[PDB]
């Protein structure tokens, strides 16, 4: 009758049955959000390669 | 006299503060490099005055400890010609000139940054003009009060004339008109050429010849009358810009003799009375 319910019961069991999904390790880890001062320069340097 | 709980809950400050020689609030803000430069230290122009010397050092910080790359003391100016009154405003000027010239010569750009060959009262900015920017150092006064006319800023003008690039403003050079908010070139000229001492040598020699003798003993016996400061500092400037280059304490007595004395004192007290 107590309308408020909250348990962590069964929660690890549900979590671990599709595994703890680690996202795929990627070559060229993303540069989103890095220092734009550094990113501008890196983009210019890739612009002027030979 | 202090309780055990005090001693046990005490936290000792850094040793360079228990000795009271360093301001760590200033030191962190001086040596904290931007982390995206990754090694480039900020070199500090550290100028210090003792009661009879003027130390000047271009130093940078490293985990093992600060590392000096060029030192200049006012007590080595007797090598260059200035023998007396080596802790005045012009003496710190010449110390700064000497240190700047030595740094520039060591880093092999002195020929390309000569600054003013002749000292000028007007505040100086050097040009980074072409392909090789000037050496850049940060002034590190230390614990002293940064007031107008300070010998730290005399050394600052010395280094600026010597060719270093030092962040600066002309609001604390000697002769700053704190009312009009601008320097006087002539007044700073006078100060960097020891004029503020020369006028007072005349001030004592005019009608107070006893205090004059008892006050300027070394000047008198080295024969520098008041009108012979100008060219003296001219020639020291030239010389500096020409050549910028057993048991007496007791040992700790050891364990053996320590308890050798302890047994003796113990027998003395327990047997006695």
């Amino acid at each position: 009758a107590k309308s408020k319910n909250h348990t962590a019961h069964n929660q690890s069991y549900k979590a671990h049955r599709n595994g703890i999904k680690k996202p795929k390790r990627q070559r060229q880890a993303s540069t989103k959000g890095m220092d734009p001062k550094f990113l501008r320069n890196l983009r210019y340097s890739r612009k002027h390669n030979v | 006299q202090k309780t055990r709980a005090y001693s046990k809950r005490f936290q000792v400050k850094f040793k360079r503060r228990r000795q009271g020689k360093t301001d760590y609030r200033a030191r962190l803000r001086l040596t904290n490099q931007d982390k995206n430069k990754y090694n480039t230290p900020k070199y500090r122009f550290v100028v210090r005055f003792t009661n009879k010397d003027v130390t000047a050092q271009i130093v940078y910080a490293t985990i093992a400890g600060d590392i000096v790359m060029a030192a200049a003391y006012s007590h080595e100016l007797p090598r260059y010609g200035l023998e007396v009154g080596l802790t005045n405003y012009a003496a710190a000027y010449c110390t700064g000139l000497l240190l700047a010239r030595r740094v520039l010569k060591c880093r092999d750009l002195d020929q390309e940054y000569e600054g003013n060959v002749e000292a000028t009262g007007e505040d100086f900015s050097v040009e980074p003009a072409d392909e090789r920017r000037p050496f850049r150092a940060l002034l590190d006064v230390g614990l002293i009060r940064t007031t107008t006319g300070n010998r730290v800023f005399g050394a600052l003008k010395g280094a600026l004339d010597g060719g270093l690039d030092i962040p600066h403003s002309d609001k604390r050079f000697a002769g700053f008109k704190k009312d009009e908010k601008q320097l006087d070139a002539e007044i700073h000229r006078k100060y960097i050429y020891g004029g503020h001492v020369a006028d007072y040598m005349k001030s004592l020699a005019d009608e107070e010849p006893e205090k004059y003798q008892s006050h300027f003993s070394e000047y008198i016996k080295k024969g520098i009358e008041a009108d012979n400061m100008e060219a003296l500092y001219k020639k020291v400037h030239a010389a500096i810009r020409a050549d910028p280059t057993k048991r007496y304490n007791p040992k700790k007595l050891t364990y053996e003799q320590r308890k050798a004395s302890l047994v003796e004192r113990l027998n003395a007290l327990n047997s006695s009375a």
């Binding site: - | 000795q19 009271g20 020689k21 230390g142 614990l143 002293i144």
Partner: protein, 164 residues
């Protein structure tokens, strides 16, 4: 040690007057100390607003000015001449100093050239041996050794064999 660096000498006379009031009362309490010192005094505001004393908080209730040097000696000798060169063998403080209190006009100076009344006042002198800057400077400040801290027995031994 009989070392010619260990001589007593005044550091400062402090001349305070606790008036606990304000207005023309304390303005004249100030100008009188001006006549004594030759230097402009500073007003000492109140704390704790103790009512039974009739003092509000943060109101100027005293006026003091610090005198040091030959002027201090010249005014201290008159201050002792008030007490006929004799103190109570208890005015001396354990650390370095002693004091006493007088009534103004037995000092030097015609009285009502300012039209200011008699103001009592607590002389308080601090003795020192040369070298307290090692406890008062900004860089490398530390305690002064016992051998060159003046204490009571030296204050008496300074007061009675000499200067009277």
């Amino acid at each position: 040690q009989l070392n010619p660096m260990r001589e007593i000498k005044v550091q400062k006379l402090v001349l305070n007057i606790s008036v606990g009031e304000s207005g023309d009362r304390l303005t004249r309490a100030a100008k009188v100390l001006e006549q004594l010192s030759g230097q402009s005094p500073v007003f000492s505001k109140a704390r704790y607003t103790v009512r039974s004393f009739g003092i509000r908080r943060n109101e100027k209730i005293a006026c003091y000015v610090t005198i040091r040097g030959e002027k201090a000696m010249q005014l201290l000798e008159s201050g002792l001449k008030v007490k006929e060169y004799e103190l109570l063998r208890r005015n001396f403080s354990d650390t370095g100093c002693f004091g006493f209190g007088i009534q103004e006009h037995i000092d030097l100076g015609m009285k009502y050239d300012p039209s200011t009344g008699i103001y009592g006042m607590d002389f308080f002198v601090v003795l020192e041996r040369a070298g307290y800057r090692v406890s008062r400077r900004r860089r490398c400040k530390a305690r002064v050794g016992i051998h060159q801290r003046v204490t009571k027995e030296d204050a008496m031994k300074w007061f009675q064999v000499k200067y009277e």
